[model samples]
Target chain A: MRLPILIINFKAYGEAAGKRAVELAKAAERAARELGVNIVVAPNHLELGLVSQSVDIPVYAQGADVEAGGAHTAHVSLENIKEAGGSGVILNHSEAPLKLNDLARLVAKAKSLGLDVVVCAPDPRTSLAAAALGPHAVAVEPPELIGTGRAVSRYKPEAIVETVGLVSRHFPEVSVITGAGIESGDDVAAALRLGTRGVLLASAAVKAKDPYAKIVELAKPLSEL
Target chain B: MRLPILIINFKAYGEAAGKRAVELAKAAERAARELGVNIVVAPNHLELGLVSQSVDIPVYAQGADVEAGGAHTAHVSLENIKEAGGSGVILNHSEAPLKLNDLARLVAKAKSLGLDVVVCAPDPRTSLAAAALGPHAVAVEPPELIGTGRAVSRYKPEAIVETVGLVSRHFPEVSVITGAGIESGDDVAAALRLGTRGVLLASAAVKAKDPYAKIVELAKPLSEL
Candidate 1:
């Protein structure tokens, strides 16, 4: 519902599948409640309803289908996510990138349904391109750093600064977020310190020894700043 | 699970969302039972678990991410489908295509999990390329004909004949399916007569005035053959 947020994506990990998905969502809720920081959890599509209904915290879908309802298959529409109780959706995730044309259409459709949209880009320039589409947020996640232990905020701080400058100058309404290898409170603080409004991360929280504790560590900085 | 099959993809259509999805799956089951023909339903990712658990008919997720468990966000893995009770999956629908490299890897990964894989293509040549991935089936759906009443079996019969000939000659193990505007038993019969082992379709079943009657009509020719 706000910037300076922490969004955790529960990708198709075994630990987050089935009933474990509910546990993970509730853990996020705990962190959000205790820290009083805006924390959102996005479970994979299959567990969307299960997790969204189980937790009181805001829930987002990892991505959604650009195509609206009717005569289509194997696509998940923004309508489906809205009806599933999802508050938002992430688009153009590096691993599952969408066409630039489709990105604009989906962002508009999702927003029209009153859902927040986070468009992911692999670099600063791409973030600017995504920002032009007018999403609620643009997350610059340098592709090379993803799934590795290298935080882009620490290693590629310039990318964050560049994205913030470009997007804010052109589309000031778009919040800038930075991620990839972001693992701790310092990483979150570093990203925000570099002018980002939030962080978009996956592994560091869902795969952590204590998901709740891990999320709290990453989210605590938002409360301070 | 056999040749001369029917797979109805409940693409993000609201007519097939929630309780409507379960009703659609049940209608398919009745057709499969009364006609003694194999029928599968592929629901959007959000409703997968609900649809699969609600019916005895084979169920599939529209598509899944090539990524496996761990650190991935917003992806539906083959493992997720296997656990959700889905017996198969459809990849590379024209609306949401996957990378060629990802397609090969996902097809192998899905088969290793004992799930059937159907890779969709927009032309006979693309179908050949998809067949080269060694999936269980390659569905040739002409992009232009989709969502229209113009059945490929009627308008582009040559494409079906060519796909069947090419795939059968090189990868006889892979079944050839033809779709795009395939709506009735006559269309199914025409496709099978062209040498395809089955048909892949949507809308006609999920959005029909009488979904049960519609599915039975589309599947009756398979039983007669």
Candidate 2:
């Protein structure tokens, strides 16, 4: 929800599902407030309302549907997230990718609903496609490195600078972030150096031996930003 | 979750998103009891828990992800729905489809958790493909007729018979349902005549001015079966 951000996703991870979703969110909030960095938690669909009310820091929905409020059964929606207390929504994560048409509509609709929107793409070229939709941020996460702990910064610095350069020149208002395989504060610092404004990661924190400790370490580098 | 069934999906429609979602589920419940027919309510993601608790007939999730539970973030899982009170889940709907590998895993996972699974497809060919995964049911709905009010049974009876026949012979445990543009009792009966065991529909009820009345009307035909 702020610059120099660290967005931790509670992707259906057993540790972060159910009541743990709220507990982990509270932990992230404490780390963010203490460390003086912007951290957001993207909770599971069913946990959105509970997590939102649990933490003062922003809570975002993992993804939302394109439709406003019609027969789009079982689909997540901007209103669903906003009314539940979410300040943000993430669109097109590789695990559950979206069609470009849906992504465009979702980003625009989510932003208009007062939810910060992050449109995720697998590469710089795709990031440009998503940035064109004018979301608050474009997160470039190489699909291969996702959950592999390779840190896109270490393995694909080209993705970081190129994604940043394109969005910077073409859509100045849209921030650029990078993720996939990000594990530590050093990994977080490495990506920032390549031009990403923030890091969007999972497993590293969601499935960690000690999520709170991992979150604090990964979030520490952002304070220097 | 039974034969001659009617499953109404409360998509992200404004009429079905929040508290109204519970109201609609209750309406569907009353109709199911009053009419003496099996019915299920598949509410929106955010409404799943509320609607499930509200209705006693049967509550199903719209869809779920392939993974069991771990860093899948924001992805819906069988455990999420089962813990939230859902007795069933719908997957691979035309609006939000799934990859074959994901579909196979989801069907197996959901069924193992005691959740009824309905795998939706656009045609007989696709239905056969989904049926191979051995879901509780394979819903054959022509994508072209979806949300168009041009019932699949009327325009594509060939799809119904073929889809039903294939699943009946190949995956006998899997029932067949037909949807997309189904609006009235006639549409329900028409599809039943073509061999489908149930109906899956949206707008006609969820977005209707009198959802209860519409549900009763559509459900009336199933009772005769």
Candidate 3:
């Protein structure tokens, strides 16, 4: 399991999906090459191909349709992720959580498609549950912390501790990343110290006026842990 | 009220969303723009901004998250959509259909946000049900016909007729559009001729090699109709 710092999002893709996707992808790839950290640029599906083709970074789709095709109209099939140029995907993200049963089924379908699965957890308990189900990685992103710039560890230290405990028990092999409202390099350090292999931050990367500076800030602590 | 073409969707955003959204938005934009028809390109919450900014035509978010703010994970509030650049929205899209009671609350919130509301019905019965709710537009799209390229008239002709009758009885002022698996200009003409005020087709247009051209082909006969 090669774990590098992960920046989980499509924020850089912004409102202009196609053009922004290209920009984010190129940026993520450059950061990956320079920092020697794994970057997961999960762009929207519409620009999945655009991001995937433009960069060598490990691009993932933000989510996937669980249907196996036919009659289920207007859904993106999980199989299309790889076809659209994503290497993996994040499921049940805080922005789009899924029912436990639905998550299990989606994970099964993703395995069938040979796509790496990254499942999200609202808390440590759910993270444990997700990891127990054996997703490739379990991201513990408390909704309270996301997008607020408060940072998870500082606002809720116990959540980090609990998340670490859960990951160790159900999935020692599964990497646990602390998430939500991670704003700066200091916050990234806090998550790493709390046994999070890396930070799963989004808005700072997505909403940043200068995404490159933010990307650099996120990558600076790659070796800090 | 403009008799805007009402798009039928299921999970128009997020990776958990179906291909219908991207495919539909891509196609519907072309169709509406070329035909000079009013269209509401409403997709799921996640993809709304992505789709809206991607196209030059009318774009909207699907189903405003009911919660106004604070700790309502996975649900995007109405204010969030407006802030995210959404112009219009759809409620109770047949795919992730909402409860009738809950739908009322959501509809009101969207009104406060000043969003164009396109209500969805799985069939004529539901169309009538949705029409009674008095949304800006009522869309009738049978779940079975969606994305099949099966003409709505050929497959579910009665549903369309019943839908128009129902809408006229309850809320004649509301615009009514019939959709689901409508392909070809002849199909568009047939839909309009059969008394449907307009047509909403997504996948056929998006998946086609030339999404813009397909819309032209489909909308060309609408003026004559």
Candidate 4:
């Protein structure tokens, strides 16, 4: 996958469950194919298999745990994610966060399973640490700005740039994705200019009246990048 | 709805993924129907819908978040679980534990959606605290004994008795279930003797070489209870 990835996390919003989840996922798939941009959808766990089977684009699970494939109730395992047709998993999102050591183990486990891992970091320091853990991507999301409708690319561009710089210095192999209130083409453009590989967003795309249109708007700038 | 309920938590064991999960669920469903017992299967989030759709027996998600219903990525919501055909959820298991306040919030949320809530606690004191939260059931499990094959009813019988007694005294409406290392009919018999409503077990049933036979064997004692 190349730069300017648009990863929409369809959180537990009412607009993204059951048929709606599959609908949003299909929209993202259509947007990705039509715009020639890399777009991933991280649907809620219950909707993962449904969405994955419904779409051709990469389907990443919301997250998995450090625990292996056994006896850990309520915890997502890489084995199950892979079995469910998920191509990758997002880890340590600000919403359902994980400890650093736990995150590292999960990242390693995902890699061992040949699954792509996107580890979320709240700041540059955490981004550097997450990059050192060798995940496929590190999404920098300011905790406070999450769901606040204030894109980090516009409000805190320096944080995105610093996170990208830190990841580049520590682990050039790790891709950087910026999130936190990203909802427009300009936000995606700014994030790319700050050197991020993409954006990891939720409500902006999921809750939109036209998820497909919103996805296109956010991903249009990606084609330019 | 009855005593000595057998709630088998499939957890994330490889044996319970994909077709295997449905197989185990069907086995438990058969045992519950043929033997006139109440048996529930709590599958991992990814398989909740699959297992629920496959069996006539009650299906529960391994866990759910306290977060109500929006913008919470990777977090299980009551709405999604219910929509996915889950009849209930198992919360705060020893392996994937939750804070007390969070547990209380999740229990309330599950109830609001008419979903049964089974909240797990580590010991008698915690069980009492969980019971006070007014969940449908409180599962008392000793973290150290989990998956150790040393059934709490046998090794720590007093803990189960105390938890039952405490819940009975305070919240008699809240059923008590004993877990941690449970593996046999004798264990189920012992838990019933301690006055618990049922047993919450994993590995012992889920990882069994013959899940169906194991479920039948374990649930057979429920008739005697």
Candidate 5:
């Protein structure tokens, strides 16, 4: 439960159920254990149950429909998520951002549903606002920096520091994570040092030539740093 | 292929290989076939190939990353989707709406990639804009009407006609699908008669006690009308 260094982030949509999804969950779990940090995989709703059952590390869903229940499409409800075996959910992820008010309401509802909520803050200001909603975690992602391969530390370290500080200030209990186009271990190390509790990464783990190895590589610096 | 009455859609994410997503895919596929309509299951980059192999219907996925392929996290490149077994992709979905210009660029990009592009529009204006971009299909789901049980024809018939007209005007070959807040066979029939090529219903299919039966119900009227 201590702040994790490496977080394996996966956002996929499609046929993620049955044995194959089970295997993927196992692989993600294995990689998380091997890396010796938290590996959080955000699978679509179709496979949340299988992934949650298959993986020990936290399994976060990409997004949930804001409605309470009954008759919603292409959206995972907070209640359904809990029933379907989701431990936590990623809200307003950079790829799935939400309006601040909507994010706040969903976070509160997720809490009411007894599901842990991890909300995304597109920048420091949004991170501050997200902190007020009392999410389990606030992910600070500089939208422009995502998938850019350009390190934010050298270019705009303040954004990271500011976001983490904002979350810590407004919601001390909330874990703060940093994301957006993070491809290097050094970036992970820097975010951790700057007060981010963890890191959220995707293509870095999903599209790697060797996914397991890449996770370990990212974790090495995250844990050591 | 025959005017899909209600296409079931899901997003797959993770480090699992394409082949690893069969279980959920099969369930969705079975449901779609039982309903007697085309079901489009969109898997992420990693599992498209395996899903395509496992499912009988056409496989779809989320949009590829903005990057062509130099470096991006687990994001599937446009080229990778076609290679991995994706016959189509759903872009600018309501959950991932984008600016008109950017969405247009993506539509062009998807076409260039030789993938069927299903662009989602939030309203009639956006739907028309999407139609102008010239994708294989246009999905119009008013944000307000989504999950509300108010079919577009009943709530906003003009939007439906406007969208259908827009598609026909710009991309005569492009098919327009109306979605959001649809539940019963009545809704699907309404959409078809309204000039929509098909209807998109997510929750009605996924959460139904008899998913296949529901699909069959949705399709019956379509064939009859």
Candidate 6:
């Protein structure tokens, strides 16, 4: 298990769409190599394979549907994720939340296909519930704080600490990560200090004027972990 | 302005996942060229760019969210679609249905971005409603008939005829396509005879033993249209 990792989520932003996604992914890769730390990227579904194939870092799908490989029209499937070169998928993100049953199924299906599952939960109780399902990781991201430039580790450290404690006490096998407005090395360091394994963040890395430099700055504190 | 179209909806089938999607798209291009008809491939979101860049034929997204390019995590945006090289997007699909408002917003956004929209409806009334939005095309597919191998145009001809009538009468600029369990040339003929401009199909072509041959077979009737 990687600790104090930096997973940059390239949401559907103007700077990270299309060919630009691959460029951003390469920047992350450069930062990861320069900082000598573990890093991953969660690009939009459209750019998952493109970025995955272009970079050496782990590539995760921003989301996937609960349906199997069948007649589910317009729905993303675990099989599709695996085939698209995605190493894992982010499930139940606040913006595209899913029911618990669907989350359970998506986790099971993704695991069965040998793809990692990173389930997103907005609070401590939900984080505990998500970790109990035995996903590779559970990200505690307060929906309101996301993209607000108010990192949860700074603005609401209690949530990350509580979620870390809950997940560690009950499901130690599952790693915990905190997200929402995590932009700087201090933000990543604070999250790791609170027992979270890493930070899952967007906006900061994707919208930065110098994305590569931004990634290096964010991954700096995690390098020695 | 493409007529007698064959928009193959590669609905998360094992054969159409990941890299295989590009193969399927090329097969469609070959069929379209051979039959001298218009054809489009709607691959999963992850494979849209891969397929779109792989072949010269028009490529469509399986779906797009109504959200704009911003903080909407996990939701696909129209900007992402355009940047990914998709020529159009399929909206209000049966499995991943959208609200009318969302569909309207998605249509407006996609059109503004210069991407064509093929809106799906489960019945004549919905098809008419979808047509009223002035999308490039509307697909009338009965929920129960989808992937059943029982063509809606053959088994429920009145639905196709009525939808075509409504769209043509009220929104003559909009084109109608009949889908759901459409498998062969006869099914395509039935839909065309009922006044649909094309067919939106999935399982029949995607899951076929020889997808290329199947596409050529299905497109045979519309070759001269």
Task: Give the range where candidate 1 chain A is weakest over 10 consecutive residues by summed lDDT.
Answer: A65-74
Predicted candidate 6 versus true structure: per-residue lDDT over A20-83, tens digit per residue: 8889999999998898888899888888877777898889888887557887767788887888
| lDDT string, candidate 6, B1-225, tens digits | 376688999888878887888889999999989989888899888887777778988888889874567776677888888888888899998988998988888888888888989999999999999999989999999999988899998899999988988888999999988899888888898889898889899888888889889999999888766
RMSD of 4: 2.7
Off by over 4 Å in 3: A10-34, A43-56, A65-76, A112-114, A123-125, A142-166, A203-210, B1-90, B105-116, B132-134, B144-158, B181-187, B202-217
Candidate 5, residues B1-225: lDDT per residue as tens digits?
345534555432221212334555676667665555566665433345556666787777655445243233223445445545567777777766667777777678878877778888887778877787888788888878876777776788788898888778777888899888778888888888889887766556555666456667766665564
What ranking emerges by TM-score with the best candidate at the front?
A: 6, 4, 1, 2, 3, 5
Q: In terms of lDDT, which candidate is stronger, 2 or 3?
A: 2
lDDT of 4 by residue, B117-211 (tens): 88899999988988999899999999988999999999999899889888899999899988988889888888888888888888788888888
Which model scores highest in TM-score? 6
Query: DockQ for each candidate?
Result: 0.47, 0.40, 0.15, 0.64, 0.08, 0.76
Which is better, 2 or 5, measured by TM-score? Answer: 2
- TM-score per candidate, chains pooled: 0.83, 0.77, 0.74, 0.89, 0.63, 0.96
**Docking quality tier of model 6:** medium
Q: After superposition, how far is residue A92 of candidate 1 from its true place, in Å?
A: 3.2
Recovered share of real interface contacts in candidate 1: 0.64
Chain B TM-score of all predictions, in order?
0.98, 0.97, 0.82, 0.96, 0.81, 0.96
Better of 4 and 6 by DockQ: 6
Best of the two (1, 2) by lDDT: 1
Model 2 chain A is weakest, by summed lDDT over 10 consecutive residues, at A65-74
- The DockQ leader among the candidates is 6
lDDT of 5 at B179: 84
- Ranked by DockQ from best down, the candidates are 6, 4, 1, 2, 3, 5
Model number with the top lDDT = 6
Tell me how candidate 2 scores on lDDT.
Answer: 0.85
TM-score, candidate number 1: 0.83
CAPRI rating of model 1: acceptable
Q: Which residue pairs in model 4 clash with each other? A: none
